[PDB]
């Protein structure tokens, strides 16, 4: 289901330290992914004022930034296709949540793009009968953003493969960030445990060096694990489908692409 050509013509790694809205009142322990930190989506008052004079400029501006973000993601994750596709999916759901105004980021863009979209739809769709609120606008036009950002992805290296969103936007931003963190942690844990079993479980200086590296990585990721786990515990009673599952078993079972097993995640984190 690759998009048509004419619309295509028309259109660090530090998890901590990011800004979250009301960090202590709620969302205690959530970590912003570096991809979301380096997201190519910046909406200012000047851009909104310049794109509100003529019909269709704001939506096309959003599509242009989505395409730029997709191109940046594809140029970053060029080695693996699955990781690049999942980064595209995560960024698409992130920008959808930002459009819907459910973003927890403290940036003015997250708290202001919903107001900008409300104002644009109000000043231009008085009698057009199209939905004027951000939520229904995203609901009806989620396919257009997908096709535009897939065009932006395809311009990077002329990739024939195409993928659908596949029910990604309705997941809350915390759960998606948690899934991304779990995927990264599980991949790095598989690599580190494979190397450790190769070099230390069949010389001593190599074993000591890899042990120090593993201890440092584990010390960082255990604090990250505890923060995300307590955040999940504060924010799991709302949904009954995820209320009865521990974070580790939720990553193992309901996440198909996480590639997280008992030994990979639970036996090393939950002990």
């Amino acid at each position: 289901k690759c998009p048509t050509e004419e619309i295509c013509k028309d259109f660090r790694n530090n998890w901590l330290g990011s800004s979250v809205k009301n960090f202590s009142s709620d969302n205690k322990g959530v970590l912003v992914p570096p991809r979301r930190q380096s997201l190519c989506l910046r909406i200012t008052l000047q851009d909104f004022r310049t794109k509100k004079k003529k019909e269709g400029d704001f939506e096309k501006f959003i599509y242009s930034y989505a395409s730029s973000e997709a191109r940046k993601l594809r140029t970053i994750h060029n080695n693996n296709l699955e990781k690049a596709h999942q980064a595209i999916r995560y960024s698409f759901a992130d920008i959808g949540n930002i459009i819907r105004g459910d973003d927890m980021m403290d940036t003015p863009t997250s708290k202001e793009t919903i107001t900008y979209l409300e104002k644009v739809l109000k000043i231009y769709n008085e009698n057009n009968d199209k939905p004027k609120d951000a939520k229904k606008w995203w609901t009806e036009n989620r396919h257009h953003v997908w096709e535009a950002m897939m065009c932006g992805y395809q311009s990077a290296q002329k990739d024939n493969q195409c993928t659908g969103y596949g029910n990604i936007d309705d997941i809350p931003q915390f759960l998606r960030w948690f899934r991304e963190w779990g995927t990264y942690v599980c991949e790095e844990s598989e690599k580190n445990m494979n190397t450790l079993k190769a070099v230390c479980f069949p010389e001593n200086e190599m074993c000591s060096s890899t042990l120090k590296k593993y201890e440092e990585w584990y010390n960082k990721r255990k604090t990250e694990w505890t923060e995300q786990s307590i955040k999940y515990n504060n924010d799991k009673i709302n949904y009954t489908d995820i209320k009865t599952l521990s974070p580790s078993e939720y990553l193992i079972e309901k996440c198909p692409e996480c590639k997280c097993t008992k030994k990979n995640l639970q036996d090393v984190f939950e002990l």
Partner: protein, 228 residues
């Protein structure tokens, strides 16, 4: 019998906008018939007390005894004396409260330093520091507002005052407010409020913006030649 009557700090004075005197008993078994009161000059006795808890894990009677009294009474040296009448000691436990008059009174110099250029180039966050220097009582309160609206207390953190190396009498303190980098690029104005006794108005506000440390002059000179 640890009746530690620590006077409330000036930051506490301008935080809750009320002067609550403290006379708390520590490490004592909880008993009854304890008639706490405050006695001042000329024999005035006005008091309201709450927060009484019978049970404590450390077996210490709370006896918090917080009463609202005007700031001018403290400014007049009313020598607020606690009069905890415990059962073991028939005489009331006298604990006076008064400002230590005689200390130096130097007004702080508030400087709102702009964020570093490299951190903004990293495009991760924007921490604006409020360097407060030169105050002798070392009782400073720092609060931040954006567009006249105070922020949440957890966004900004204030360090405890510590003595200045060059000036032994004066003290200095610092505080940082962390916001997004594009939030700084938006053009919002951040105000740093510094509360101190020595200030003529007891507070001082400084405003930071994008246009506070920008290069006022650019001296580019494009010279191109076709000869060696």
């Amino acid at each position: 019998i640890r009746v530690f009557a620590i006077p409330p700090s000036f930051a506490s004075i301008f935080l809750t906008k009320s002067t609550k005197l403290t006379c708390l008993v520590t490490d004592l078994t909880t008993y009854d018939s304890v008639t706490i009161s405050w006695t001042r000059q000329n024999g005035e006795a006005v008091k309201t007390h709450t927060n009484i808890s019978e049970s404590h894990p450390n077996a210490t009677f709370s006896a918090v005894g917080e009463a609202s009294i005007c700031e001018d009474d403290w400014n007049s040296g009313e020598r607020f004396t606690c009069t905890v009448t415990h059962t073991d000691l028939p005489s009331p436990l006298k604990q006076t409260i008064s400002r230590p008059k005689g200390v130096a009174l130097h007004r702080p110099d508030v400087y709102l330093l702009p964020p570093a250029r490299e951190q903004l180039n990293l495009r991760e966050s924007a921490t604006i520091t409020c360097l407060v220097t030169g105050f002798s009582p070392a009782d400073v309160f720092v609060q931040w507002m954006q567009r006249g609206q105070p922020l949440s207390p957890e966004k900004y953190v204030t360090s405890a005052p510590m003595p200045e190396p060059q000036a032994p009498g004066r003290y200095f303190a610092h505080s940082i407010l962390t916001v997004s980098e594009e939030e700084w690029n938006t053009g919002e104005t951040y105000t740093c409020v510094v509360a101190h006794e020595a200030l003529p108005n007891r507070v001082t506000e400084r405003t930071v913006d994008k246009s506070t440390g920008k290069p006022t002059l650019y001296n580019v000179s494009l010279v191109m030649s076709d000869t060696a």
